[PDB]
Structures are given as structure tokens and as C-alpha cells.
Write a protein that binds this DNA or RNA. Structure first.
Ligand SMILES: [Zn+2]
Ligand SMILES: [Zn+2]
Ligand SMILES: [Zn+2]
Length: 85
DNA sequence: AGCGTGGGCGG
DNA sequence: TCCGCCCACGC
């Protein structure tokens, strides 16, 4: 944790600089990635990608048990667990 | 469910 | 640094 957050009202520390730079955007309100379709801005590129799937209906992740598809891998992970009970 | 969004991290 | 995952938590 050699990269602490300078903003006085915040107590965060990071292992890498790349993360402090990304984290700083929370305080600056910096939203660099815009959606062509709805023009909404996002703080992260990876979140813009998944958001875009809400428009196209793209669902790359299918459940191994029932085949139900989802836009994100975490949605599928949360789902598969329901086949236990 | 649907999906916003930050942290850790490998490349 | 960026990229783009996993992972996690929120409403
Ligand atoms: Zn901060
Ligand atoms: Zn959009
Ligand atoms: Zn299933």
C-alpha cells in the first residue's frame, strides 16, 4: 500500500499507482467512456462494454445446467448456484 | 432479475 | 498507463 489517496476526506491506499489514478476519478467525477446509443457516461471502459449489452441484448454467458444466458459472467455465477436449491 | 460501479490484478 | 477480467456489493 505505497500509494495513498491525497483527498483529505478519504482513507484509501493502493498497491499500484494505476489503481490510485483510477480511484481518483471517483473524487473528480471523471467519466471518460460514453455510450453511443444512449449517450450516458461511465467511469470505466469495462462497465461501458457490459452496459452496451443492455441495448443490443447480447448475452455471452450461458448456464452449464440449464443454458440460461446472461450479459455478464457475474450474473451467470449468481444464477448457477440456484440449481443446488 | 437487471445492471450500476469500485477494488485487485495480470498482461 | 491502459485494458479487460474476476469479484463483490448495492438497490
Ligand atoms: Zn479518495
Ligand atoms: Zn447506453
Ligand atoms: Zn441455470
Amino acid at each position: 500500500r505505497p500509494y495513498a489517496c491525497p483527498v483529505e476526506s478519504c482513507d484509501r491506499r493502493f498497491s499500484r499507482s494505476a489503481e490510485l489514478t483510477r480511484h481518483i476519478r471517483i473524487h473528480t467525477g471523471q467519466k471518460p467512456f460514453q455510450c453511443r446509443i444512449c449517450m450516458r457516461n461511465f467511469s470505466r471502459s469495462d462497465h461501458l462494454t457490459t452496459h452496451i449489452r443492455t441495448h443490443t441484448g447480447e448475452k455471452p454467458f450461458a448456464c452449464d445446467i440449464c443454458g440460461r444466458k446472461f450479459a455478464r459472467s457475474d450474473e451467470r455465477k449468481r444464477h448457477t448456484k440456484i440449481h443446488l436449491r
